[PDB]
Design a protein around this ligand. Structure first.
Ligand SMILES: Nc1ccn([C@@H]2O[C@H](COP(=O)(O)O[C@@]3(C(=O)O)C[C@@H](O)[C@@H](O)[C@@H]([C@H](O)CO)O3)[C@@H](O)[C@H]2O)c(=O)n1
Ligand SMILES: Nc1ccn([C@@H]2O[C@H](COP(=O)(O)O[C@@]3(C(=O)O)C[C@@H](O)[C@@H](O)[C@@H]([C@H](O)CO)O3)[C@@H](O)[C@H]2O)c(=O)n1
Lengths: 130, 128
């Protein structure tokens, strides 16, 4: 039988492994954070830790189609504000459906708007999860 | 209806993201965007795969370069790229992507590019 139920909070990246920058960050800051946390994206939060947006590798491509010399560009000018988030109590099986339906690759995990971690497609494809 | 193998589910023909060896990074961006897979393949004139370039590659490039539009794709592409044959079971393409921590696969026959597939294609086809 199915051994145990897997929720997003069980396999999300948390603490210092969460990719996160503030509203004052630049695109350069975003790149460095994206690279460091290995999820292909970063969240952006306000001073209270509330999620304000995300910026993905795909977002970078789209930016580079319209701008050059982007290292000092404020993250707020280029991020996705109406981003998709999930609660930690979501089933992993539910999350994978959301990635498919919304055509995205990673999810910030939140509680009351407050960022608590992140997952991506590869977390959901781990052995035994689905 | 038939969705067993990679060849069944891949983007193929003109839906494949592909540019030639002579292309620039600007050409790569346009193609990456147009075909919606977050990557492009690079082929020689004969249609043989020479490399790939992904959205993650672009991040890594932007960490060490600026003003990249005119840069030749050969200078930044991944040459030793992972490829699959069309005869791969679709479930096995998922397993490769997971184990290798990659997000799309060019499909080949003896190095000749025939298509490309990513995780979203597999999800949409009911593979998982
Ligand atoms: N939790 C999330 C994750 C992503 N997004 C937004 O959704 C859009 C699509 O996300 P993406 O990660 O950029 O999606 C891409 C894309 O560029 O569209 C990336 C690309 O590498 C490739 O993986 C393709 C897939 O082939 C699916 O289209 O998908 C982006 O504007 C992003 O900021 C969001 O609102 N909330
Ligand atoms: N068929 C392929 C596909 C990709 N690659 C190469 O594999 C490397 C990783 O591919 P990526 O798509 O850039 O992979 C990323 C990356 O940035 O490394 C993207 C990011 O969304 C995220 O999915 C992370 C994983 O989360 C890391 O575990 O993976 C790249 O240099 C790419 O050229 C390859 O050789 N052959």
């Amino acid at each position: 039988g199915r051994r145990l139920l897997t929720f997003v909070r069980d396999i999300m990246h948390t603490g210092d492994d969460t990719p996160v920058i503030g509203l004052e960050a630049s695109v350069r800051d975003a790149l460095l954070e994206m690279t460091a946390k290995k999820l292909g994206m970063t969240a952006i939060v306000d001073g209270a830790g509330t999620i304000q947006g995300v910026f993905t590798d795909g977002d970078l491509r789209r930016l580079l189609e319209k701008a050059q010399d982007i290292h000092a560009t404020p993250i707020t000018a280029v991020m996705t504000r109406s981003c998709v988030t999930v609660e930690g109590s979501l089933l992993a099986a539910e999350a994978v459906r959301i990635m498919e339906q919304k055509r995205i690759n990673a999810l910030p995990v939140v509680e009351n708007g407050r960022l608590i971690g992140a997952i991506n497609m590869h977390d959901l494809l781990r052995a035994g999860v689905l």
